[PDB]
Amino acid sequence: EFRPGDKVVLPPYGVGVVAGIAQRSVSGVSRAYYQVDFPGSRSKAYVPVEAPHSVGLRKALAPEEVPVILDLLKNGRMPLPKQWAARHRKTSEILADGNPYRIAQMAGQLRAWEVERGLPDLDRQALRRAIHLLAEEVAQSLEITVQEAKRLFEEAWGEELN
DNA sequence: CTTGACAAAAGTGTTAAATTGTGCTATACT
């Protein structure tokens, strides 16, 4: 369940607070619907209360989960196919998937490769867009704007952030 | 109208940088 003021995630919307629940008229009878808003978008969202766990509606990590993610961010890697197709495809799916542990785990190998040989014009967006959801997630949990939030990664990276 | 001495300009040769030309990947899709 999600109360009015719960801090949640709605892929790929990064983070947003739930405003409440309402009966939206969809087709036939109106099932209950959760409401996820994003002030840094001015968008809007309606999430069915039936199976919230099927839309990948997770919740912002707690301040306790910062170090673990950082540790899997600095070191943790993972092999990927050589031809750009499968590799970038996988990375993309992982991105839209909305999984901070997987996005960070990915960011690790992507980082190891970026300063070695160097990152293709594709995997670059697959890195940037990856660090984006992270930097904002940190801003949701620790309530510190993308300035400070991005200032976090600098430690477990070795370099600053864009 | 003539030498000798010189610096600038125009050559001549080998390189580092860049720019351009190519083959190719594999779920299935007719």
mmCIF file of all heavy atoms in Angstrom, chain B residues 12-28:
data_model
loop_
_atom_site.group_PDB
_atom_site.id
_atom_site.type_symbol
_atom_site.label_atom_id
_atom_site.label_comp_id
_atom_site.label_asym_id
_atom_site.label_seq_id
_atom_site.Cartn_x
_atom_site.Cartn_y
_atom_site.Cartn_z
ATOM 1 P P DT B 12 61.409 22.136 -55.386
ATOM 2 O OP1 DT B 12 62.601 22.019 -56.256
ATOM 3 O OP2 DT B 12 60.060 21.945 -55.961
ATOM 4 O "O5'" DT B 12 61.567 21.129 -54.157
ATOM 5 C "C5'" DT B 12 62.843 20.985 -53.553
ATOM 6 C "C4'" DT B 12 62.819 19.970 -52.422
ATOM 7 O "O4'" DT B 12 62.291 20.568 -51.208
ATOM 8 C "C3'" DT B 12 61.993 18.714 -52.688
ATOM 9 O "O3'" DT B 12 62.757 17.590 -52.283
ATOM 10 C "C2'" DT B 12 60.770 18.914 -51.795
ATOM 11 C "C1'" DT B 12 61.380 19.664 -50.621
ATOM 12 N N1 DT B 12 60.392 20.416 -49.798
ATOM 13 C C2 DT B 12 60.543 20.456 -48.428
ATOM 14 O O2 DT B 12 61.455 19.905 -47.837
ATOM 15 N N3 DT B 12 59.577 21.174 -47.769
ATOM 16 C C4 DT B 12 58.499 21.839 -48.329
ATOM 17 O O4 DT B 12 57.684 22.459 -47.652
ATOM 18 C C5 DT B 12 58.404 21.753 -49.766
ATOM 19 C C7 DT B 12 57.280 22.432 -50.491
ATOM 20 C C6 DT B 12 59.340 21.053 -50.420
ATOM 21 P P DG B 13 62.222 16.096 -52.536
ATOM 22 O OP1 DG B 13 63.288 15.362 -53.253
ATOM 23 O OP2 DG B 13 60.867 16.155 -53.128
ATOM 24 O "O5'" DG B 13 62.090 15.502 -51.058
ATOM 25 C "C5'" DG B 13 63.163 15.701 -50.145
ATOM 26 C "C4'" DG B 13 62.793 15.248 -48.745
ATOM 27 O "O4'" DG B 13 62.100 16.314 -48.040
ATOM 28 C "C3'" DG B 13 61.884 14.024 -48.708
ATOM 29 O "O3'" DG B 13 62.301 13.144 -47.675
ATOM 30 C "C2'" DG B 13 60.522 14.639 -48.398
ATOM 31 C "C1'" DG B 13 60.916 15.785 -47.480
ATOM 32 N N9 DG B 13 59.899 16.828 -47.381
ATOM 33 C C8 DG B 13 59.212 17.416 -48.415
ATOM 34 N N7 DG B 13 58.352 18.313 -48.021
ATOM 35 C C5 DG B 13 58.471 18.316 -46.637
ATOM 36 C C6 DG B 13 57.788 19.086 -45.666
ATOM 37 O O6 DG B 13 56.915 19.945 -45.847
ATOM 38 N N1 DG B 13 58.207 18.777 -44.374
ATOM 39 C C2 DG B 13 59.165 17.844 -44.061
ATOM 40 N N2 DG B 13 59.437 17.684 -42.758
ATOM 41 N N3 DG B 13 59.814 17.116 -44.963
ATOM 42 C C4 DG B 13 59.417 17.404 -46.226
ATOM 43 P P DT B 14 61.691 11.659 -47.573
ATOM 44 O OP1 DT B 14 62.823 10.719 -47.707
ATOM 45 O OP2 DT B 14 60.529 11.546 -48.483
ATOM 46 O "O5'" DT B 14 61.149 11.570 -46.076
ATOM 47 C "C5'" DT B 14 61.968 11.985 -44.996
ATOM 48 C "C4'" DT B 14 61.105 12.239 -43.777
ATOM 49 O "O4'" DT B 14 60.282 13.407 -44.025
ATOM 50 C "C3'" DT B 14 60.156 11.098 -43.415
ATOM 51 O "O3'" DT B 14 60.124 10.952 -41.994
ATOM 52 C "C2'" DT B 14 58.823 11.576 -43.984
ATOM 53 C "C1'" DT B 14 58.929 13.082 -43.788
ATOM 54 N N1 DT B 14 58.029 13.866 -44.684
ATOM 55 C C2 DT B 14 57.293 14.881 -44.123
ATOM 56 O O2 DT B 14 57.361 15.178 -42.943
ATOM 57 N N3 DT B 14 56.487 15.547 -45.007
ATOM 58 C C4 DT B 14 56.324 15.313 -46.354
ATOM 59 O O4 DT B 14 55.556 15.993 -47.031
ATOM 60 C C5 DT B 14 57.117 14.226 -46.879
ATOM 61 C C7 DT B 14 57.030 13.868 -48.333
ATOM 62 C C6 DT B 14 57.919 13.560 -46.030
ATOM 63 P P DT B 15 59.290 9.763 -41.300
ATOM 64 O OP1 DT B 15 60.267 8.948 -40.545
ATOM 65 O OP2 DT B 15 58.409 9.108 -42.292
ATOM 66 O "O5'" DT B 15 58.356 10.522 -40.248
ATOM 67 C "C5'" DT B 15 57.724 11.736 -40.626
ATOM 68 C "C4'" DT B 15 56.979 12.354 -39.461
ATOM 69 O "O4'" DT B 15 56.142 13.428 -39.951
ATOM 70 C "C3'" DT B 15 56.046 11.402 -38.727
ATOM 71 O "O3'" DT B 15 55.926 11.807 -37.371
ATOM 72 C "C2'" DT B 15 54.738 11.573 -39.496
ATOM 73 C "C1'" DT B 15 54.789 13.019 -39.990
ATOM 74 N N1 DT B 15 54.282 13.152 -41.385
ATOM 75 C C2 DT B 15 53.362 14.135 -41.678
ATOM 76 O O2 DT B 15 52.953 14.930 -40.852
ATOM 77 N N3 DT B 15 52.954 14.163 -42.987
ATOM 78 C C4 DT B 15 53.356 13.314 -44.004
ATOM 79 O O4 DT B 15 52.930 13.416 -45.150
ATOM 80 C C5 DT B 15 54.309 12.303 -43.624
ATOM 81 C C7 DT B 15 54.822 11.322 -44.637
ATOM 82 C C6 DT B 15 54.716 12.268 -42.350
ATOM 83 P P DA B 16 55.234 10.843 -36.285
ATOM 84 O OP1 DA B 16 56.176 10.702 -35.153
ATOM 85 O OP2 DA B 16 54.726 9.637 -36.977
ATOM 86 O "O5'" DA B 16 53.969 11.683 -35.791
ATOM 87 C "C5'" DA B 16 54.135 13.052 -35.440
ATOM 88 C "C4'" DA B 16 52.801 13.774 -35.462
ATOM 89 O "O4'" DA B 16 52.369 13.943 -36.838
ATOM 90 C "C3'" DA B 16 51.684 13.033 -34.735
ATOM 91 O "O3'" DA B 16 50.915 13.964 -33.974
ATOM 92 C "C2'" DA B 16 50.889 12.409 -35.882
ATOM 93 C "C1'" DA B 16 51.059 13.438 -36.989
ATOM 94 N N9 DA B 16 50.900 12.864 -38.324
ATOM 95 C C8 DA B 16 51.394 11.669 -38.765
ATOM 96 N N7 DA B 16 51.093 11.396 -40.013
ATOM 97 C C5 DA B 16 50.343 12.486 -40.419
ATOM 98 C C6 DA B 16 49.723 12.808 -41.641
ATOM 99 N N6 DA B 16 49.764 12.023 -42.722
ATOM 100 N N1 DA B 16 49.052 13.976 -41.708
ATOM 101 C C2 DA B 16 49.009 14.762 -40.626
ATOM 102 N N3 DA B 16 49.553 14.568 -39.426
ATOM 103 C C4 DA B 16 50.212 13.400 -39.388
ATOM 104 P P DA B 17 49.463 13.564 -33.408
ATOM 105 O OP1 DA B 17 49.195 14.436 -32.244
ATOM 106 O OP2 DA B 17 49.402 12.095 -33.227
ATOM 107 O "O5'" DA B 17 48.475 13.980 -34.595
ATOM 108 C "C5'" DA B 17 48.541 15.305 -35.110
ATOM 109 C "C4'" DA B 17 47.242 15.735 -35.769
ATOM 110 O "O4'" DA B 17 47.199 15.229 -37.127
ATOM 111 C "C3'" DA B 17 45.959 15.269 -35.093
ATOM 112 O "O3'" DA B 17 45.003 16.318 -35.219
ATOM 113 C "C2'" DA B 17 45.599 14.019 -35.899
ATOM 114 C "C1'" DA B 17 46.064 14.406 -37.298
ATOM 115 N N9 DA B 17 46.454 13.292 -38.160
ATOM 116 C C8 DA B 17 47.082 12.125 -37.817
ATOM 117 N N7 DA B 17 47.298 11.320 -38.835
ATOM 118 C C5 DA B 17 46.777 12.006 -39.921
ATOM 119 C C6 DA B 17 46.683 11.708 -41.299
ATOM 120 N N6 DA B 17 47.134 10.582 -41.867
ATOM 121 N N1 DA B 17 46.096 12.630 -42.088
ATOM 122 C C2 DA B 17 45.637 13.762 -41.551
ATOM 123 N N3 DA B 17 45.669 14.151 -40.281
ATOM 124 C C4 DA B 17 46.255 13.220 -39.516
ATOM 125 P P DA B 18 43.458 16.072 -34.855
ATOM 126 O OP1 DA B 18 42.896 17.371 -34.421
ATOM 127 O OP2 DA B 18 43.377 14.910 -33.943
ATOM 128 O "O5'" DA B 18 42.797 15.669 -36.255
ATOM 129 C "C5'" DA B 18 42.894 16.545 -37.376
ATOM 130 C "C4'" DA B 18 41.958 16.097 -38.482
ATOM 131 O "O4'" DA B 18 42.642 15.112 -39.296
ATOM 132 C "C3'" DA B 18 40.691 15.430 -37.948
ATOM 133 O "O3'" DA B 18 39.460 16.197 -38.142
ATOM 134 C "C2'" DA B 18 40.696 14.007 -38.514
ATOM 135 C "C1'" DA B 18 41.767 14.045 -39.598
ATOM 136 N N9 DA B 18 42.527 12.801 -39.692
ATOM 137 C C8 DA B 18 43.119 12.115 -38.670
ATOM 138 N N7 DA B 18 43.730 11.021 -39.055
ATOM 139 C C5 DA B 18 43.519 10.982 -40.423
ATOM 140 C C6 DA B 18 43.910 10.070 -41.422
ATOM 141 N N6 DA B 18 44.633 8.972 -41.175
ATOM 142 N N1 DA B 18 43.533 10.330 -42.690
ATOM 143 C C2 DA B 18 42.812 11.430 -42.935
ATOM 144 N N3 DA B 18 42.385 12.359 -42.083
ATOM 145 C C4 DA B 18 42.776 12.072 -40.832
ATOM 146 P P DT B 19 39.003 16.784 -39.573
ATOM 147 O OP1 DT B 19 39.901 17.905 -39.922
ATOM 148 O OP2 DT B 19 37.549 17.031 -39.477
ATOM 149 O "O5'" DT B 19 39.210 15.588 -40.613
ATOM 150 C "C5'" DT B 19 39.776 15.865 -41.889
ATOM 151 C "C4'" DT B 19 39.286 14.885 -42.944
ATOM 152 O "O4'" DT B 19 39.832 13.563 -42.697
ATOM 153 C "C3'" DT B 19 37.776 14.706 -43.067
ATOM 154 O "O3'" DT B 19 37.478 14.644 -44.454
ATOM 155 C "C2'" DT B 19 37.529 13.370 -42.368
ATOM 156 C "C1'" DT B 19 38.792 12.608 -42.740
ATOM 157 N N1 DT B 19 39.145 11.474 -41.831
ATOM 158 C C2 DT B 19 39.660 10.318 -42.375
ATOM 159 O O2 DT B 19 39.832 10.159 -43.569
ATOM 160 N N3 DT B 19 39.959 9.337 -41.462
ATOM 161 C C4 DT B 19 39.806 9.399 -40.090
ATOM 162 O O4 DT B 19 40.105 8.466 -39.351
ATOM 163 C C5 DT B 19 39.270 10.638 -39.587
ATOM 164 C C7 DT B 19 39.063 10.813 -38.112
ATOM 165 C C6 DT B 19 38.973 11.604 -40.467
ATOM 166 P P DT B 20 35.962 14.513 -44.968
ATOM 167 O OP1 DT B 20 35.791 15.501 -46.056
ATOM 168 O OP2 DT B 20 35.061 14.555 -43.796
ATOM 169 O "O5'" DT B 20 35.911 13.049 -45.613
ATOM 170 C "C5'" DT B 20 36.992 12.677 -46.460
ATOM 171 C "C4'" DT B 20 37.006 11.199 -46.810
ATOM 172 O "O4'" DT B 20 37.515 10.421 -45.695
ATOM 173 C "C3'" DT B 20 35.654 10.603 -47.186
ATOM 174 O "O3'" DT B 20 35.846 9.796 -48.340
ATOM 175 C "C2'" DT B 20 35.291 9.775 -45.953
ATOM 176 C "C1'" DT B 20 36.667 9.313 -45.492
ATOM 177 N N1 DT B 20 36.760 8.845 -44.075
ATOM 178 C C2 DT B 20 37.331 7.616 -43.841
ATOM 179 O O2 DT B 20 37.751 6.900 -44.730
ATOM 180 N N3 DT B 20 37.384 7.247 -42.524
ATOM 181 C C4 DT B 20 36.939 7.973 -41.438
ATOM 182 O O4 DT B 20 37.030 7.561 -40.286
ATOM 183 C C5 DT B 20 36.357 9.251 -41.746
ATOM 184 C C7 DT B 20 35.847 10.106 -40.626
ATOM 185 C C6 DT B 20 36.295 9.626 -43.033
ATOM 186 P P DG B 21 34.592 9.233 -49.173
ATOM 187 O OP1 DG B 21 34.615 9.874 -50.505
ATOM 188 O OP2 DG B 21 33.375 9.325 -48.337
ATOM 189 O "O5'" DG B 21 34.942 7.688 -49.372
ATOM 190 C "C5'" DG B 21 36.285 7.289 -49.628
ATOM 191 C "C4'" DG B 21 36.461 5.816 -49.307
ATOM 192 O "O4'" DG B 21 36.679 5.641 -47.882
ATOM 193 C "C3'" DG B 21 35.263 4.943 -49.669
ATOM 194 O "O3'" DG B 21 35.733 3.699 -50.193
ATOM 195 C "C2'" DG B 21 34.542 4.802 -48.329
ATOM 196 C "C1'" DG B 21 35.722 4.738 -47.367
ATOM 197 N N9 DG B 21 35.390 5.089 -45.988
ATOM 198 C C8 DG B 21 34.734 6.215 -45.550
ATOM 199 N N7 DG B 21 34.568 6.252 -44.257
ATOM 200 C C5 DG B 21 35.143 5.069 -43.809
ATOM 201 C C6 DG B 21 35.263 4.559 -42.495
ATOM 202 O O6 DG B 21 34.870 5.069 -41.437
ATOM 203 N N1 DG B 21 35.912 3.326 -42.477
ATOM 204 C C2 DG B 21 36.386 2.669 -43.587
ATOM 205 N N2 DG B 21 36.987 1.489 -43.366
ATOM 206 N N3 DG B 21 36.281 3.139 -44.825
ATOM 207 C C4 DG B 21 35.650 4.339 -44.860
ATOM 208 P P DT B 22 34.716 2.665 -50.886
ATOM 209 O OP1 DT B 22 35.238 2.371 -52.239
ATOM 210 O OP2 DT B 22 33.341 3.189 -50.732
ATOM 211 O "O5'" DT B 22 34.825 1.344 -49.989
ATOM 212 C "C5'" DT B 22 34.842 1.430 -48.573
ATOM 213 C "C4'" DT B 22 34.997 0.075 -47.915
ATOM 214 O "O4'" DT B 22 35.095 0.270 -46.482
ATOM 215 C "C3'" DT B 22 33.817 -0.861 -48.132
ATOM 216 O "O3'" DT B 22 34.253 -2.213 -48.114
ATOM 217 C "C2'" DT B 22 32.929 -0.533 -46.937
ATOM 218 C "C1'" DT B 22 33.957 -0.271 -45.842
ATOM 219 N N1 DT B 22 33.482 0.703 -44.819
ATOM 220 C C2 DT B 22 33.704 0.452 -43.482
ATOM 221 O O2 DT B 22 34.276 -0.540 -43.069
ATOM 222 N N3 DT B 22 33.222 1.417 -42.635
ATOM 223 C C4 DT B 22 32.560 2.579 -42.980
ATOM 224 O O4 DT B 22 32.166 3.386 -42.143
ATOM 225 C C5 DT B 22 32.363 2.779 -44.392
ATOM 226 C C7 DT B 22 31.656 4.003 -44.891
ATOM 227 C C6 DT B 22 32.826 1.845 -45.231
ATOM 228 P P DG B 23 33.318 -3.374 -48.715
ATOM 229 O OP1 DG B 23 34.072 -4.039 -49.798
ATOM 230 O OP2 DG B 23 31.984 -2.797 -48.998
ATOM 231 O "O5'" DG B 23 33.156 -4.398 -47.499
ATOM 232 C "C5'" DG B 23 34.295 -4.984 -46.886
ATOM 233 C "C4'" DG B 23 33.917 -5.585 -45.543
ATOM 234 O "O4'" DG B 23 33.637 -4.511 -44.610
ATOM 235 C "C3'" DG B 23 32.686 -6.489 -45.566
ATOM 236 O "O3'" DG B 23 32.921 -7.643 -44.750
ATOM 237 C "C2'" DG B 23 31.587 -5.584 -45.009
ATOM 238 C "C1'" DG B 23 32.357 -4.691 -44.045
ATOM 239 N N9 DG B 23 31.765 -3.370 -43.860
ATOM 240 C C8 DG B 23 31.257 -2.548 -44.836
ATOM 241 N N7 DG B 23 30.795 -1.419 -44.375
ATOM 242 C C5 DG B 23 31.012 -1.498 -43.005
ATOM 243 C C6 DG B 23 30.713 -0.568 -41.981
ATOM 244 O O6 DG B 23 30.183 0.546 -42.086
ATOM 245 N N1 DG B 23 31.097 -1.041 -40.727
ATOM 246 C C2 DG B 23 31.693 -2.258 -40.496
ATOM 247 N N2 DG B 23 31.991 -2.541 -39.219
ATOM 248 N N3 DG B 23 31.976 -3.138 -41.447
ATOM 249 C C4 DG B 23 31.609 -2.693 -42.672
ATOM 250 P P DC B 24 31.832 -8.825 -44.665
ATOM 251 O OP1 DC B 24 32.567 -10.092 -44.883
ATOM 252 O OP2 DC B 24 30.687 -8.493 -45.538
ATOM 253 O "O5'" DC B 24 31.306 -8.777 -43.153
ATOM 254 C "C5'" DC B 24 31.816 -7.824 -42.222
ATOM 255 C "C4'" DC B 24 30.931 -7.710 -40.992
ATOM 256 O "O4'" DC B 24 30.576 -6.326 -40.756
ATOM 257 C "C3'" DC B 24 29.617 -8.481 -41.079
ATOM 258 O "O3'" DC B 24 29.334 -9.137 -39.860
ATOM 259 C "C2'" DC B 24 28.577 -7.399 -41.350
ATOM 260 C "C1'" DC B 24 29.177 -6.225 -40.593
ATOM 261 N N1 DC B 24 28.733 -4.916 -41.118
ATOM 262 C C2 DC B 24 28.267 -3.944 -40.229
ATOM 263 O O2 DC B 24 28.241 -4.204 -39.018
ATOM 264 N N3 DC B 24 27.864 -2.748 -40.721
ATOM 265 C C4 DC B 24 27.916 -2.524 -42.035
ATOM 266 N N4 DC B 24 27.511 -1.334 -42.488
ATOM 267 C C5 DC B 24 28.384 -3.508 -42.955
ATOM 268 C C6 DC B 24 28.780 -4.680 -42.459
ATOM 269 P P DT B 25 28.695 -10.610 -39.868
ATOM 270 O OP1 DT B 25 29.819 -11.572 -39.822
ATOM 271 O OP2 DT B 25 27.716 -10.681 -40.974
ATOM 272 O "O5'" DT B 25 27.888 -10.677 -38.490
ATOM 273 C "C5'" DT B 25 28.607 -10.515 -37.281
ATOM 274 C "C4'" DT B 25 27.844 -9.620 -36.321
ATOM 275 O "O4'" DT B 25 27.652 -8.310 -36.920
ATOM 276 C "C3'" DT B 25 26.458 -10.117 -35.920
ATOM 277 O "O3'" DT B 25 26.321 -9.921 -34.513
ATOM 278 C "C2'" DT B 25 25.531 -9.216 -36.738
ATOM 279 C "C1'" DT B 25 26.315 -7.911 -36.699
ATOM 280 N N1 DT B 25 25.913 -6.874 -37.709
ATOM 281 C C2 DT B 25 26.037 -5.539 -37.385
ATOM 282 O O2 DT B 25 26.447 -5.145 -36.309
ATOM 283 N N3 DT B 25 25.646 -4.665 -38.370
ATOM 284 C C4 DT B 25 25.162 -4.982 -39.626
ATOM 285 O O4 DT B 25 24.841 -4.123 -40.442
ATOM 286 C C5 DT B 25 25.063 -6.394 -39.903
ATOM 287 C C7 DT B 25 24.552 -6.862 -41.232
ATOM 288 C C6 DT B 25 25.438 -7.257 -38.948
ATOM 289 P P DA B 26 24.882 -10.007 -33.799
ATOM 290 O OP1 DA B 26 24.225 -8.685 -33.905
ATOM 291 O OP2 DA B 26 25.091 -10.606 -32.464
ATOM 292 O "O5'" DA B 26 24.072 -11.061 -34.686
ATOM 293 C "C5'" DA B 26 22.740 -10.763 -35.083
ATOM 294 C "C4'" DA B 26 21.845 -11.990 -35.019
ATOM 295 O "O4'" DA B 26 22.028 -12.829 -36.186
ATOM 296 C "C3'" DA B 26 22.048 -12.896 -33.812
ATOM 297 O "O3'" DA B 26 20.781 -13.405 -33.426
ATOM 298 C "C2'" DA B 26 22.964 -13.994 -34.347
ATOM 299 C "C1'" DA B 26 22.556 -14.085 -35.815
ATOM 300 N N9 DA B 26 23.662 -14.337 -36.728
ATOM 301 C C8 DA B 26 24.942 -13.873 -36.622
ATOM 302 N N7 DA B 26 25.721 -14.261 -37.604
ATOM 303 C C5 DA B 26 24.894 -15.028 -38.409
ATOM 304 C C6 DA B 26 25.111 -15.732 -39.611
ATOM 305 N N6 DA B 26 26.287 -15.774 -40.244
ATOM 306 N N1 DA B 26 24.064 -16.393 -40.148
ATOM 307 C C2 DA B 26 22.885 -16.352 -39.519
ATOM 308 N N3 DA B 26 22.560 -15.730 -38.388
ATOM 309 C C4 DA B 26 23.618 -15.081 -37.881
ATOM 310 P P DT B 27 19.829 -12.556 -32.448
ATOM 311 O OP1 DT B 27 19.424 -11.314 -33.142
ATOM 312 O OP2 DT B 27 20.501 -12.473 -31.133
ATOM 313 O "O5'" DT B 27 18.542 -13.486 -32.273
ATOM 314 C "C5'" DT B 27 18.668 -14.855 -31.912
ATOM 315 C "C4'" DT B 27 17.358 -15.604 -32.094
ATOM 316 O "O4'" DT B 27 16.346 -14.997 -31.249
ATOM 317 C "C3'" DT B 27 16.767 -15.592 -33.499
ATOM 318 O "O3'" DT B 27 16.092 -16.819 -33.753
ATOM 319 C "C2'" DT B 27 15.787 -14.426 -33.468
ATOM 320 C "C1'" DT B 27 15.301 -14.440 -32.024
ATOM 321 N N1 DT B 27 14.974 -13.067 -31.542
ATOM 322 C C2 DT B 27 13.655 -12.727 -31.344
ATOM 323 O O2 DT B 27 12.733 -13.504 -31.514
ATOM 324 N N3 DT B 27 13.453 -11.442 -30.913
ATOM 325 C C4 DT B 27 14.418 -10.480 -30.683
ATOM 326 O O4 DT B 27 14.140 -9.349 -30.299
ATOM 327 C C5 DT B 27 15.775 -10.897 -30.924
ATOM 328 C C7 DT B 27 16.908 -9.939 -30.708
ATOM 329 C C6 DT B 27 15.985 -12.152 -31.342
ATOM 330 P P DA B 28 15.672 -17.219 -35.252
ATOM 331 O OP1 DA B 28 15.332 -18.659 -35.256
ATOM 332 O OP2 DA B 28 16.727 -16.721 -36.160
ATOM 333 O "O5'" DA B 28 14.339 -16.370 -35.521
ATOM 334 C "C5'" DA B 28 13.194 -16.552 -34.686
ATOM 335 C "C4'" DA B 28 12.064 -15.599 -35.050
ATOM 336 O "O4'" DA B 28 12.303 -14.293 -34.461
ATOM 337 C "C3'" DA B 28 11.862 -15.361 -36.544
ATOM 338 O "O3'" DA B 28 10.479 -15.466 -36.886
ATOM 339 C "C2'" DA B 28 12.372 -13.940 -36.762
ATOM 340 C "C1'" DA B 28 12.024 -13.299 -35.426
ATOM 341 N N9 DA B 28 12.792 -12.094 -35.116
ATOM 342 C C8 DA B 28 14.151 -11.971 -35.053
ATOM 343 N N7 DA B 28 14.567 -10.762 -34.754
ATOM 344 C C5 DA B 28 13.397 -10.037 -34.619
ATOM 345 C C6 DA B 28 13.147 -8.683 -34.312
ATOM 346 N N6 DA B 28 14.113 -7.789 -34.073
ATOM 347 N N1 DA B 28 11.860 -8.283 -34.257
ATOM 348 C C2 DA B 28 10.893 -9.177 -34.496
ATOM 349 N N3 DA B 28 11.005 -10.471 -34.795
ATOM 350 C C4 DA B 28 12.294 -10.841 -34.843
#
